Design a binder for this molecule. Structure first.
Ligand SMILES: CC(=O)SCCNC(=O)CCNC(=O)[C@H](O)C(C)(C)COP(=O)(O)OP(=O)(O)OC[C@H]1O[C@@H](n2cnc3c(N)ncnc32)[C@H](O)[C@@H]1OP(=O)(O)O
Ligand SMILES: CC(=O)SCCNC(=O)CCNC(=O)[C@H](O)C(C)(C)COP(=O)(O)OP(=O)(O)OC[C@H]1O[C@@H](n2cnc3c(N)ncnc32)[C@H](O)[C@@H]1OP(=O)(O)O
Length: 290
């Protein structure tokens, strides 16, 4: 009988991290994301832990349900305990609990998840594509005159940065409607580098920005973290230009070494921008729902 938990002891947390680590080693992709792992020590989400057969042992299944749209579930069954109905049981428990509204993330959209989705009568409703390109044979930026490029100068630039971010991402669930609070939270992370946030200004109002990211724990990789062009300055080549400039900067600072990004599969403009600069699909995360 699956018991929804709102909190976990230190041992239980260690048992879930062990299950996740064991699974990544076999599957080659982590089964739940980094934020799920940060939620293990908090009381903000709900969890299912499926214990093994004998006392004193490791767990064999885990599901996290994060509140919102519908809630989002991430789950994992140990490679050695698959094809025994555990994933199906935890998934049906989440659907019953959320009235059939929650979604499920499948990192890497691996064969088992696709089949399990099929078996549960779910369909893919979102695809988040991770694209990558090598740090070699990189593009050259074309800077149109009437535009000047420089890096972020601190809080002096925040008003414009939020204005542009919020105009470009207007109506976007998570990236739109930002405030100084979101900026401060990110500037507070160890990976932040003000010189990695590139800005293009008219020659002037901010026209667009490309926030790049190098994480200390993933050597040799750079990320196009947020790219946004004010709609008043879109369709003039700035988005590509900014992405190019960021690749140059990351390649200077830095499987194979590379620049990666995550983009919604139906974001036509961004996908085209990235395709023009040589990015290709590396992996896809599919959100499954009824
Ligand atoms: C919709 C989702 O599951 S999103 C889940 C995202 N999580 C992951 O991808 C993490 C890595 N994968 C896992 O942890 C597991 O493989 C899970 C959670 C996807 C499935 O866990 P399991 O406990 O093996 O699922 P379960 O035993 O209930 O399988 C249900 C049915 O789906 C199918 N299925 C599951 N895995 C496979 C597979 N590798 N190949 C073919 N069919 C499969 C079968 O029809 C199966 O029943 P059957 O064994 O009687 O034929
Ligand atoms: C990793 C991430 O940041 S994913 C999130 C990306 N950012 C967003 O979704 C924010 C909202 N969108 C935007 O800010 C912009 O549309 C951007 C940044 C994606 C592109 O900015 P732009 O300045 O318009 O880019 P640019 O003028 O160089 O055009 C690049 C390509 O997109 C295409 N494009 C631009 N706007 C559109 C549009 N409205 N419809 C269809 N295609 C478009 C261009 O035709 C061009 O295609 P091509 O590469 O095949 O030549």
């Amino acid at each position: 009988a699956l018991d929804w938990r709102s909190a976990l002891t230190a041992d239980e947390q260690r048992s879930v991290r062990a299950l996740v680590t064991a699974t990544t080693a076999v599957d080659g992709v982590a089964p739940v994301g980094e934020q799920v792992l940060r939620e293990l020590g908090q009381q903000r989400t709900e969890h299912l832990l499926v214990a093994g057969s004998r006392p004193g042992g490791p767990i064999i299944g885990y599901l996290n349900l994060s509140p919102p749209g519908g809630a989002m579930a991430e789950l994992v069954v140990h490679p050695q305990s698959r094809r025994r109905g555990i994933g199906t049981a935890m998934a049906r428990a989440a659907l019953a609990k959320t009235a059939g509204r929650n979604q499920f993330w499948a990192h890497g959209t691996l064969d088992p998840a696709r089949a399990t989705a099929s078996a549960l009568g779910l369909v893919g409703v979102r695809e988040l594509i991770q694209m990558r390109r090598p740090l070699r044979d990189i593009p050259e930026p074309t800077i149109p005159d009437g535009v000047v490029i420089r890096t972020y100068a601190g809080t002096s630039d925040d008003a414009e940065l939020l204005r542009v971010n919020n105009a470009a991402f207007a109506g976007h669930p998570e990236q739109g409607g930002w405030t100084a609070v979101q900026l401060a939270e990110r500037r507070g992370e160890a990976w932040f580098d003000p010189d990695g946030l590139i800005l293009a200004f008219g020659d002037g109002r901010l026209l667009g920005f490309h926030w790049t990211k190098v994480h200390p724990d993933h050597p040799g990789l750079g990320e196009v973290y947020v790219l946004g062009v004010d709609p008043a300055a879109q369709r003039r080549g700035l988005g590509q230009m900014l992405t190019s400039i960021g690749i140059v900067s990351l390649a200077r600072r830095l499987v194979e070494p590379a620049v990666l990004l995550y983009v919604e599969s139906d974001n036509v403009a961004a996908v085209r921008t990235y395709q023009s600069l040589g990015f290709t699909t590396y992996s896809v995360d599919t959100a499954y729902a009824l």
